[PDB]
Symmetry: C3
Subunit: 542 residues, 3 copies
């Protein structure tokens, strides 16, 4: 069946010369194409995108003169306020509280409404209060003279309950600078670059307009970019995020991979002591004095700077473009769908019985009846119960698609399709000579109301009973045809049924399932009788 392989099925189409429908089609196509191109270009859907692999290296710079009422002036440098960047973050100490000479011993705990005692009964041995850095020994002792407080085993003397200094000791930390070196890679695209390129000015400091590509940031500038007071956030500390966004196109014609610097405060501006506002931690400087292990505890407050590097690098990928085009292809059939919907809707008689009289504007849309008739063809399932009846008086045909069960087809009305016995209205029918189960089918008249019969019509005699015509029809199909007398009569009788059905019902779709009236049936049978036997009747083709 190689010939079956080498076959191409092309749809049958109707081409309409309509201003409106062609204009609609082209408008739809232009709009769809424009949106598809716009989406492709704007979202770069032709590109395979890869997240950035980043490495950050910071260099902080600046010294601070610190005033401490002990008054003494001291200079702090990088070794004293910062530690090298770890995990894309660096910390600059802005403030501190110091507690010198701590030994692991037993000491009276610093007085507070909790630790104040009036007798030994107010303390419990081994009690770990969450707001304490020690474990009670059960007895309370003098802190300073009159005042009695719970004794604890801990690093002693205990820290004073004091607030962070105001102003911050390292308030000059706003004039410090940080140089950020950012290296990025797209391993899939095998593209690595960096934020500092040859020819970049190193004598600059970042400004979002003047110097938007300078990687040297003054911390005060950052805070101002974000809308915060460095002098205030310095007192208790904070977290600031330096976002480096990489929107990179790796196509060599449209190549562009530069960073965009932005800033965002990352700590909640909470004043709730319960939530530990700011950013601080306790750091121990261990040492030895007089063979005793001692500790200087610094409560460090500062600002942690987080370098948040994110972005994508895109490069043209054939497969992504293919996928996007394939997804968008089906949107070009919507013009056809919409116009076919219009043709189907405006083909309904409802749109002229009611709609047009009200809205006369839509009257010219009646042409869609022509488009529908030239577009759609309707066919019914050729079931064995399917039947068609035509009445000469009536101006149409009836599709009786229901079982005739003890009910004459004359009285069994069905759906409306366009082009002596009690049930007889022409006076030329005979009772059905067939099984009473199916007699009702053959109990049909040429008409619904009394009057003349259609077997009297002069056309019937010449379009159904004319022997010359029927024999010529037989010869047309079979030029050299010879038959017995009975065979000739049978061939003629079947041709007569065929010709009547074609005459009254037209198309062969309805003439195959047509039903002849009893009058015409028996007239034809009389004209072309059979030698012996009984006539079978109607037989459904399928």
């Amino acid at each position: 069946s190689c010939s079956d392989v080498f076959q191409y099925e092309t749809n049958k189409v109707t081409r309409i010369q309509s201003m409106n429908y062609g204009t609609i089609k082209w408008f739809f196509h232009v709009i769809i194409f424009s949106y598809v191109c716009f989406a492709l270009v704007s979202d770069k859907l032709y590109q395979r995108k890869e997240p950035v692999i980043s490495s950050v290296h910071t260099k902080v710079k600046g010294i601070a003169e610190v005033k401490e009422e002990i008054l003494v002036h001291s200079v702090f440098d990088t070794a004293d306020y910062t530690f090298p960047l770890q995990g894309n973050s660096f910390f600059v100490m802005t403030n501190f509280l110091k507690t010198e000479g701590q030994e692991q011993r037993l000491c009276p705990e610093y007085p507070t409404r909790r630790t104040l005692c009036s007798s030994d009964r107010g303390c419990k041995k081994g009690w770990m209060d969450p707001q304490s850095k020690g474990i009670q020994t059960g007895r309370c002792v003098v802190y300073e003279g009159n005042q009695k407080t719970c004794e604890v085993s801990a690093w002693c003397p205990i820290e004073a309950v004091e607030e962070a200094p105001r102003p911050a000791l390292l308030n000059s930390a706003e004039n410090f600078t940080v140089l950020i070196k950012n290296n990025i890679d797209f391993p899939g695209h095998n593209y690595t670059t960096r934020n500092i390129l040859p020819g970049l000015n190193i004598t600059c400091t970042f400004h979002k307009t003047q110097n938007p590509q300078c990687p040297i940031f003054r911390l005060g500038d950052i805070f101002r970019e974000t809308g915060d007071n460095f002098s205030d956030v310095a007192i208790q500390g904070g977290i600031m995020g330096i976002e480096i966004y990489w929107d990179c196109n790796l196509d060599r014609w449209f190549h562009h991979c530069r960073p965009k610097y932005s800033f965002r405060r990352l700590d909640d501006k909470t004043t709730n002591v319960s939530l530990y506002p700011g950013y601080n931690f306790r750091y121990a400087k261990y040492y030895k004095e007089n063979n005793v292990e001692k500790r200087t505890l610094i409560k460090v407050f500062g600002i942690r700077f987080d370098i948040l590097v994110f972005g994508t690098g895109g490069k043209f990928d054939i497969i992504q473009l293919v996928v996007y085009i394939g997804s968008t292809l089906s949107y070009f059939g919507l013009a056809a769908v919409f116009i076919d919907f219009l043709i189907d809707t405006y083909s309904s008689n409802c749109c002229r019985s009611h709609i047009y009289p009200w809205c006369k504007c839509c009257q010219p849309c009646v042409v869609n009846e022509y488009y529908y008739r030239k577009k759609c063809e309707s066919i019914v399932e050729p079931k064995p119960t399917l039947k068609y009846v035509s009445f000469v008086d009536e101006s149409h045909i009836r599709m009786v698609n229901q079982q005739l069960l003890g009910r004459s087809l004359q009285d069994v009305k069905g759906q409306e399709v366009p082009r002596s016995p009690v049930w007889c209205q022409c006076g030329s029918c005979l009772p059905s000579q067939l099984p009473e189960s199916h007699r009702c089918l053959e109990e049909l008249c040429c008409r619904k109301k009394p009057g003349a019969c259609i077997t009297t019509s002069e056309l019937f005699r010449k379009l159904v009973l004319s022997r010359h015509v029927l024999q010529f029809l037989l010869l047309y199909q079979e030029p050299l045809l010879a038959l017995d007398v009975d065979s000739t009569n049978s061939r003629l009788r079947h041709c007569a049924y065929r010709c009547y059905a074609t005459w009254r019902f037209g198309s062969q779709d309805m003439a195959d399932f047509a039903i002849l009236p009893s009058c015409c049936r028996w007239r034809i049978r009389k004209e072309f009788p059979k030698s012996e036997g009984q006539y079978s009747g109607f037989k459904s083709p399928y």
Copy 2:
């Protein structure tokens, strides 16, 4: 050609009134639509998704009483067991081994099966053993009395080969808490939020059911969530991961962005000393005594906690929805594809010659023959070798789509299509008077087996030779038509060929490529001869 632009091609369609096929179509459509909607909703394919940009800040809390057999009790606080979170991780020391008063000197290395010597020959000067922290000087000396061990230059005294203390010195570290503050951003969606919201209870501790949004975690609770013993993992250490998952919908109607906390052990539970089980490191406390640079070495064991923050934030995007709909649109033609497949398959005669007799269930599916005939029209390539022959005796036509090369078309049988000379079976043919290369074409008879001729048929004389009919056919196309005698004969002869071909082959598709038999051809030529010259014969239209 503006009119050519303003054209709409609509497919010709056949509408079938079938219960089965309409039900199948609507079932397919409902299922496809339901699945498309389900996928869109479940995977939120209408949303553009953006990975989370996270910042974590931890605050650990708790003190531990530590027993060391030197027995001495000591209190450890945050300054003694933890360092501020770096890179989304914090470390809590749970155990330690201490080696005090180390000087860079020469010392006997701690005894092991490796370092035990019996003479100086067992050591090599400058030898860096991987299991050693020193470099041999070549000579071995007394470690403690009788026992001789390799001498090394190193920090001395060398560490003892001892196991981590059991129980862990800071085993109370399970009662410590950590408050995690997590800030997240979606820069593309310009949406930042945090894990602690106003009105959240700070007096809580996390419980996956009671307190699933409390960011205060007791370390023992974490280990239990994961199914581990804090007391065991404390001895040698470990790594625990605190996963914060953000499934965030940023649509204001369906907005939801809260974290989901989970826990996962991140260290292999390996007991293989070769793989360095646990988590430990050697930390040096440098100091000065007697103007000598000394070191206290602590082998620190603890649990490193990694805060693993991941997730996506989605917001409705028009383009993503368009793409998804476009991808899913083509699935609505599968009903048509499947039903057309059914109509094509059940139209085959194979499905009734064999299938129906066996499986009588499928007999009612014969109606698809009607659907096929009303659906598909078949046409062959009008090649110059294409030819059609009809034999009056035969009940069909033959498509001889092959070159007749010295072989009379009578004997050259081809494919089966439905509706005196040695090769003559009617006794009314003449030899072909044309080039012998193509004579074989015109060497055709009206029939395949002996008998009468079809030129004798009464229809032929009236449908091919009747001058009145032919002149009327000519006049129909050309009402006022006048011709010369020879021109009249030629017009009539061609009309006779046309009418015979239409009579026997029917459609003009087959009548254009039809071939008249020699008998009929020469009868027609005799009826309508030409004044002079020889008859050309058949000429392929294409």
Copy 3:
């Protein structure tokens, strides 16, 4: 209207038995299918992919003998050159400069072209020079004998301006090893694994061919992999990245999740002192001597190693496959689109008037005229101005789709379609007896140039004026039909218009909008006159 629901519209198609077009269709289909399968397989578009969640744990190993000209030999171990991995990075000190015994005091700043003074006027009190670690007191003092330099408040003595030692003190750091343990998770796929599996050899060191899965890396090996000198990068320092790529398939049949190790230098190989080449930082060792707070400052140079873990884990997802198939489905209609384009193009007369004479190769493609005629049907908008005129002399018909406004239709020529009064060319027409606004329509002749009339044609009399024929046509539609005399004449006259229009214009599409010539119109009206009144004329069906 449940029957309307139970309807299936199937496209009418034409099946072509062409070698070329079937071969083209199957070639297109095979190519499209092959590419779709290839893209699906290669990009694993059936898979849902999830980024990796990673945790890294390093263990560095090795000791270094360090020579310092003070010459003194010292051994450095892990406690002396590295700190535990923080944020997926570890640092190994390779070199250092030491400045012992620093006190916060006033000191002469180290001499440079900047700090050299000749008098007190060269210094400004409180001046913070960016290249200084102190704040000037306004006066300059002796540094060493003759040489005078600006005095500053700072940690003193000030650091010497000296270069990093050559060779690096810890140049043996290339023989150090690092064991990397990498744990990964795909939470969506609920799949966690690790880079070290049971049965892996721990006595190995990484080699990209011999030992590609060993997680023990010698730092010198890394530098060589990247193409760098450890001895040079050690002097000032650097950043090296150890990339661990995870291309993981989580399908149990095709499961594979192993790491791929690669190396990349992450620091710019810049020699520009202005950009701070290398990797170094200043670290303070604080201590106490004689109750004085002192500092040993180490300028640390080393190599920071960044463990860069990236990758995706994919697992089969039904929805992704559905989406991809839906996107690719519309590419299977391109064969139809292309072949229909060919059939439309090769159907044009332009392709035979010009193209074929030049390029005779393309002559056999004329069959596409047959394919077009059997494929496309063209229909015009049935506007009320649409009209068709046929002239017996002419060999075609004219579609006059324009308003006849005071211009006889005889002289109003329109588009070309295939099959006594001054404007009369047959001598058998009469002036139009209708409103002069529309008389011009009825002012049409049977012909364009002088001669006989078509009302004289014998067919016209029998195909338009034969009463027997017309009454038979009426009876065919209405077998039993009785009419009044005037009604009979009207029915016959309209049937005559219908039959002439069908005879001359053929299809009813053109015969509904046909216009009869004045001669034929008035001949028919004379044959079948009306009892009283005036004839209305032509009426557009739509």
